[PDB]
Amino acid sequence: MNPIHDRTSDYHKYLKVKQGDSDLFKLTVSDKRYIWYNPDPKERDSYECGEIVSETSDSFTFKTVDGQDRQVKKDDANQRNPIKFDGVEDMSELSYLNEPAVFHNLRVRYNQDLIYTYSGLFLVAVNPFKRIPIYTQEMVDIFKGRRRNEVAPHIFAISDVAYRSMLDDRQNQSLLITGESGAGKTENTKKVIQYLASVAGRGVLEQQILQANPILEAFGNAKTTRNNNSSRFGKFIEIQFNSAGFISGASIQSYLLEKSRVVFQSETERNYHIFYQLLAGATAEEKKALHLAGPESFNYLNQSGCVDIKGVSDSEEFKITRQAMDIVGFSQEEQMSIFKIIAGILHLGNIKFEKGAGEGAVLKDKTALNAASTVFGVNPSVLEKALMEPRILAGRDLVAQHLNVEKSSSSRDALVKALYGRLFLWLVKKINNVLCQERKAYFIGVLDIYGFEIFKVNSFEQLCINYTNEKLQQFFNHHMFKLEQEEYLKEKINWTFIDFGLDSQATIDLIDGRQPPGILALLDEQSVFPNATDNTLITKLHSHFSKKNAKYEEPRFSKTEFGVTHYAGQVMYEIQDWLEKNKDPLQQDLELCFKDSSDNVVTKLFNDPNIASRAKKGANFITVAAQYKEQLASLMATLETTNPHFVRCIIPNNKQLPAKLEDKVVLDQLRCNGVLEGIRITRKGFPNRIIYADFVKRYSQKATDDPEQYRFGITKIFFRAGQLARIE
Ligand SMILES: Nc1ncnc2c1ncn2[C@@H]1O[C@H](COP(=O)(O)OP(=O)(O)O)[C@@H](O)[C@H]1O
Ligand code: ALF
Ligand SMILES: [Mg+2]
């Protein structure tokens, strides 16, 4: 029996709306009409259902939950849909498209663990915060080759539509998964990869593609206050296919990892998972060979007050990480080298600098220094000198500095952040060498960026993340509304322009603009000015934007913060350390020390120019900001060469709890994502069009010729959704 028609199947049980009863049938055939209204006009996102009891030519009168009757103009009313629509799979079918109506449909589905719903052309996914059995091999097989309208909403379905569009159109595709922090982007990405690896698979390669993930999550993910498994790097995964449509390989591009987390974490957060995995899961012999102990013994692990995550065993995860490294093909010596570096970082963090006779720092106890040097394979006298007495040029003269305690500690931190960041890039490079083995014919690119985030303290890391999220929202705006309406004009189909009111360009320009200069440009200029400080930097930003740019705020309550109004809301950024973060300095004497390491992995991190070298920009090294803007611009150029498919992940609440939809939290996301606007253009517009000549040869204007479902353009014929798909 076909699972899609069998009401006893797990497909029906977990992906279809449950059968209503006799009492529901009664309510469903009622002739009564209802409206969504706010009991408290100050709380615009809390709605109740009232019965419409009478009407005039221009008004409705309705009963409230408590009793009393209210009036409202017909043009301001948010009418409730007939309840036969509750649970509908595609919301472009609703008679009434308004905020509480769309939220209500998502709610009915979520209450019975139906997390996926279409909104016209894109998918909406609401995080369940629990396991639902809809990703087994048996589920994969059901979606295989099925068209969107033949099956229920699912991440698998949209993945298959991209795959078929790649085969039938011979063009590259992309799956763009949006969402604020913890919304479900990474979990959904994993399912897209799973599906494509199965439906287009032949083996070992497909397993290696899958086992790349645990390695990268171990080194690249950490507990933040918004997500227990937060991705602290962005990633674009290119799944590559041959001309026949079989998987031929994969390539991973990463985006700027949060190196600062290695040396500092806020209260309740954790460092990267890998540190806890090694300390919990190391063999008693490894622990002696690496001079390890428990987390509480290390400064880099004992400052947050949190060393574990509910429902996670770090010892079990370490076993998974190691099994992944084997399948991928990291040798046993390479693995030991990797953990020697992790262990050395921890030891470096334990070095305690103290004031000496004068202002220069000294090191009284050498225990931590010696254990680090042992595992890294470097000379401890050289390391010590490089940390506290690094040599620089003054003119052309060579002068030994003697750093104070604060500067010595900061330099040790820079070493640690460089070690960890370069290791991460090396891991990605090694994975890519294994997974990518053939020139591709086509690709489906899967984008999993770090999600929009706000904390008590927001720094340069959060500005880079949030800018990226704004750029991705504008790409949605561009393809859904802007490019769409421009086609209707060029083709004179008597289309009337609509302003959908979604435009992130002003904010994007405030951040990355070149003339006049934006925030990143002024940061770069200050970064190479020898007399610049964090105070001259914030003064410059206020001078250029305060009361001049509508997306900027100089706050009256602080002298070290500035505010940017993003699509997802206003964020206040603290300027402390931005110059040093943008320059990303590392004493050369530290690099010279580690170049002489006996370890074969440590030596590649400091001698491979693709990992250890930095591009020049005239007389200065390229800034972090300039490098990042360039990487992102290149991503966006690549996406513009694909046919994009969108998944909008929505977080239900801010507590990481299941079965708890919070009205204001969800509605804020639907508004700023442009979900309703996306539905309206899908209904009022003409998604399908093809040159008349190419239409006659497959399915000129006389030849080609229900009148409503098409319109004749200057060079193409335009169909609404419903017609062009239903004639082939
Ligand atoms: N479809 C899902 N099924 C089960 N758990 C999910 C699902 N999607 C999100 N998660 C839960 O939410 C958490 C955070 O989601 P994640 O995809 O890591 O966020 P981001 O959007 O920041 O990558 C996951 O670790 C998991 O606990
Ligand atoms: F925590 Al995320 F994208 F992994 F916001
Ligand atoms: Mg993630």
The answer, yes or no, to whether any atom of ligand 2 lies below 6 A from the CB of 182, is yes
Nearest to 528 by CA among 627, 616, 460, 620: 620
Rounded Cα distance, 513 and 36, in Å = 43
Which residues, 6 or more positions from 464, have their beta carbon under 8 angstroms from its beta carbon?
A: 256, 625, 628
Rounded Cα distance, 311 and 330, in Å = 29
The answer, yes or no, to whether any atom of ligand 2 lies below 6 A from the CB of 181, is yes
Nearest to 223 by CA among 311, 350, 95: 311
Cα 451 to averaged position of ligand 2 atoms, centre (Å): 5
Check: CB of residue 52 under 8 Å from CB of residue 41: no
Nearest Cα residue to atom 27 of ligand 1: 129
Strands of 48-55's sheet in order across? 69-73, 59-63, 48-55, 34-37, 78-79
* Parallel/antiparallel/unpaired status of strands 122-126 and 78-79: unpaired
Q: Any known ligand binding at 183?
A: yes
Check: CB of residue 667 under 8 Å from CB of residue 45: yes
Q: Between the CA of residue 82 and those of 21, 27, 87, 103, what are the distances in Å?
A: 17, 10, 11, 15
Residue 254 sits at φ, ψ, to 5 deg, of -95, 160
Q: Between the CA of residue 147 and those of 151, 423, 425, 721, what are the distances in Å?
A: 7, 43, 39, 14
Nearest to 176 by CA among 469, 584, 379, 554: 469
In the numeric block, the tokens 């809390």 are attached to 46
Which ligand lies nearest to the CA atom of residue 179 in the structure? Answer: 1
Cα 188 to averaged position of ligand 1 atoms, centre (Å): 8
Rounded to 10°, the helix 460-477/663-673 angle is 60
Residue 498 sits at φ, ψ, to 5 deg, of -120, 135
Residue 125 sits at φ, ψ, to 5 deg, of -125, 120
Q: What angle do CA 641, 648, 161 make, to 5 degrees?
A: 55
151 burial type by CB count under 10 A (0-12 exposed, 13-18 middle, 19+ buried): middle
CATH code where residue 491 lies: 1.20.58.530
3-class secondary-structure state, position 446: strand
Alpha helices in 441-493 (DSSP H): 460-477, 483-490
Alpha helices in 350-379 (DSSP H): 367-376
Distance of CA 52 to the CA centre of its chain: 43
Catalytic site includes residue 181: yes
184 burial type by CB count under 10 A (0-12 exposed, 13-18 middle, 19+ buried): buried
Ramachandran class of 459: left when φ > 0, alpha when ψ lies in -120 to 50, beta otherwise = beta
Catalytic site includes residue 411: no
Nearest to 139 by CA among 12, 254, 265, 247: 12
3-class secondary-structure state, position 135: coil
Ramachandran class of 170: left when φ > 0, alpha when ψ lies in -120 to 50, beta otherwise = left
Torsion, Cα of 306, 309, 315, 317 (10° steps): -130
Distance of CA 6 to the CA centre of its chain: 37
The answer, yes or no, to whether any atom of ligand 2 lies below 6 A from the CB of 230, is yes
Q: What angle do CA 92, 47, 39 make, to 5 degrees?
A: 150
Catalytic site includes residue 230: yes
Q: Between the CA of residue 528 and those of 156, 365, 390, 580, 625, what are the distances in Å?
A: 49, 37, 21, 11, 13
Beta bridge partners of 235: 254, 448
520 burial type by CB count under 10 A (0-12 exposed, 13-18 middle, 19+ buried): buried
Nearest to 305 by CA among 269, 258, 251, 257: 269
Beta-carbon neighbour count of residue 330 at 10 Å?
A: 19
Instruction: Please give the structure tokens belonging to residue 61.
Output: 């009168």
Q: What angle do CA 665, 667, 668 make, to 5 degrees?
A: 70
Rounded Cα distance, 211 and 503, in Å = 39
The answer, yes or no, to whether any atom of ligand 2 lies below 6 A from the CB of 221, is no
Rounded Cα distance, 290 and 344, in Å = 8
Which ligand lies nearest to the CA atom of residue 230 in the structure? Answer: 2
Atom of ligand 1 nearest to the CA of 155: 1
Which residues, 6 or more positions from 238, have their beta carbon under 8 angstroms from its beta carbon?
A: 250, 251, 252, 253, 440, 443, 444, 445
Which residues, 6 or more positions from 658, have their beta carbon under 8 angstroms from its beta carbon?
A: 128, 129, 130
DSSP state of 442: E
How much is the CA Rg of the chain, to the nearest whole Å? Answer: 29
Which ligand lies nearest to the CA atom of residue 126 in the structure? Answer: 1
Instruction: Please give the structure tokens belonging to residue 477.
Output: 């705006």
Rounded Cα distance, 420 and 112, in Å = 44
Instruction: Give the resolution value in Å.
Output: 2.0
Rounded to 10°, the helix 600-607/332-349 angle is 70
Atom of ligand 2 nearest to the CA of 465: 5
Rounded Cα distance, 320 and 334, in Å = 17
Nearest Cα residue to atom 1 of ligand 2: 230
3-class secondary-structure state, position 235: strand
Rounded Cα distance, 390 and 588, in Å = 8
The answer, yes or no, to whether any atom of ligand 1 lies below 6 A from the CB of 182, is yes
Return the amino acid letter for 282.
A
Q: Between the CA of residue 618 and those of 341, 477, 615, 626, what are the distances in Å?
A: 34, 37, 10, 13
Rounded Cα distance, 451 and 38, in Å = 31
> What string of DSSP letters covers 74-87?
TTT-EEPPPGGGTT
305 burial type by CB count under 10 A (0-12 exposed, 13-18 middle, 19+ buried): exposed
Q: Any known ligand binding at 224?
A: no
Q: Any known ligand binding at 180?
A: yes
The answer, yes or no, to whether any atom of ligand 1 lies below 6 A from the CB of 173, is no
Check: CB of residue 720 under 8 Å from CB of residue 121: no
Atom of ligand 1 nearest to the CA of 115: 1
Check: CB of residue 566 under 8 Å from CB of residue 470: yes
Can you give 591-654 as a three-state secondary structure string?
Answer: HHHHHCCCCHHHHHHHHCHHHHCCCEECCEECCHHHHHHHHHHHHHHHHHCCEEEEEEEECCCC
Which residues, 6 or more positions from 478, have their beta carbon under 8 angstroms from its beta carbon?
A: none
Q: Catalytic one among 117, 178, 188, 230?
A: 230
DSSP state of 18: P
Atom of ligand 1 nearest to the CA of 125: 1
Q: Which helix (H) or strand (E) holds 185?
A: helix 185-199
DSSP state of 122: E
Strands (E), 631-715: 643-650, 688-691, 710-712
The answer, yes or no, to whether any atom of ligand 2 lies below 6 A from the CB of 220, is no
> What string of DSSP letters covers 498-557?
-------HHHHHHHH-TTTT-HHHHHHHHHT-TT--HHHHHHHHHHHHTTT-TTEE--SS
Euclidean distance between the first and the last CA atom of the chain, given in angstroms as a whole number: 27
Nearest to 512 by CA among 524, 528, 503: 524
Q: Which helix (H) or strand (E) holds 117?
A: strand 116-119
Instruction: Describe the chain by its helix, strand, coil percentages, rounded to 5.
Output: 45, 15, 40
Q: Between the CA of residue 5 and those of 11, 336, 410, what are the distances in Å?
A: 9, 53, 64
Nearest to 209 by CA among 256, 173, 251: 251
Domain around 528: 460-582+630-640
